[PDB]
Amino acid sequence: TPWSKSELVRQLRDLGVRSGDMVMPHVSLRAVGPLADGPQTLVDALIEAVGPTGNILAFVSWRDSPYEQTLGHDAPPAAIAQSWPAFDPDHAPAYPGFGAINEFIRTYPGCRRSAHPDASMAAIGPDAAWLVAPHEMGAAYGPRSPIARFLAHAGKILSIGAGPDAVTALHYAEAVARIEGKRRVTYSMPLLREGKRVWVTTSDWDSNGILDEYAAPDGPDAVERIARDYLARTRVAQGPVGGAQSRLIDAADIVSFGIEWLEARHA
Numbered sequence: 001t002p003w004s005k006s007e008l009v010r011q012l013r014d015l016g017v018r019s020g021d022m023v024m025p026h027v028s029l030r031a032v033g034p035l036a037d038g039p040q041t042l043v044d045a046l047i048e049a050v051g052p053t054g055n056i057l058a059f060v061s062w063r064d065s066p067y068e069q070t071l072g073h074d075a076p077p078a079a080i081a082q083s084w085p086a087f088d089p090d091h092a093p094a095y096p097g098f099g100a101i102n103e104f105i106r107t108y109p110g111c112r113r114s115a116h117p118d119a120s121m122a123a124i125g126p127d128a129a130w131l132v133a134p135h136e137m138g139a140a141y142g143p144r145s146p147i148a149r150f151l152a153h154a155g156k157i158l159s160i161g162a163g164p165d166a167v168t169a170l171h172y173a174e175a176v177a178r179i180e181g182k183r184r185v186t187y188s189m190p191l192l193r194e195g196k197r198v199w200v201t202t203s204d205w206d207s208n209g210i211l212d213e214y215a216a217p218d219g220p221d222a223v224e225r226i227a228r229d230y231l232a233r234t235r236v237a238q239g240p241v242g243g244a245q246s247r248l249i250d251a252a253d254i255v256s257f258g259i260e261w262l263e264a265r266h267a
């Protein structure tokens with residue numbers, strides 16, 4: 001049998017999602033298994049589980065982010081710059097590599113979307129406008145970003161069959177850690193500003209490895225190493241959602257652990 005909305009709500013409640021919570025899900029739909037109405041069923045169950053006062057925040061990004069094509073240039077190359085679509089928050093699809101559920105979240109009625117084209121965050125709930133803005137170039141996952149507000153707002157991370165590399169909020173620990181040698185990237189995004197396309201060039205912390213030893217692609221990064229150490233050392237609610245082994249993590253706790261872990265290892 002495929003899982004019904006009501007069964008997933010029950011499981012989410014057994015795991016510890018309460019009415020009013022602020023949740024950031026990371027979902028492997030393959031693990032979950034078959035759903036009554038496809039992925040919309042799990043979206044629907046999440047919304048019901050947090051209730052009319054709860055909030056959902058998701059890292060959705062942008063299917064057509066020109067990140068690789070502009071990485072390391074002081075300006076977009078000319079082929080890119082002439083023809084690349086400007087980021088349109090109402091219509092730009094989610095990046096499919098961060099989870100097929102994110103396109104269902106972002107198109108949910110009333111969903112708000114953040115303005116950062118590559119780091120774009122979507123939010124549903126009464127606090128959604130406050131969560132998603134500001135979201136400036138140069139502040140992808142660190143202070144002043146939606147992640148920072150989620151951490152101040154008692155956020156919980158819900159990992160539904162996702163691995164320890166999927167914990168986006170740990171890039172906040174990388175941004176703020178007082179460690180030597182932190183990598184930075186320079187890249188360019190096409191924004192829509194008063195109906196016109198504008199290319200904006202920025203630098204930010206490298207989200208694909210904050211130090212050279214975390215930057216191999218083959219290759220656990222710091223997010224994954226922190227999360228694995230954390231999960232070995234901490235009591236975390238664990239249980240099934242659909243067919244997937246799921247965890248509910250206190251986001252402020254895991255980020256604090258991450259800052260200490262990084263600062264304890266790098267001089």
Ligand SMILES: CN[C@@H]1[C@@H](O)[C@@H](O[C@@H]2[C@@H](O)[C@H](O[C@H]3O[C@H](CN)CC[C@H]3N)[C@@H](N)C[C@H]2N)OC[C@]1(C)O
Binds near residue numbers: 061065168207220223
């Ligand atoms: C949509 N643009 C994205 C861009 O935002 C960024 O994406 C990274 C992503 O590669 C990392 O994750 C990826 O690489 C990790 C090891 N490097 C392992 C997990 C894997 N999903 C995330 N932890 C942070 C994102 N911003 O670099 C890759 C990309 C596709 O160009």
Ligand SMILES: [Mg+2]
Binds near residue numbers: 126
């Ligand atoms: Mg509230």
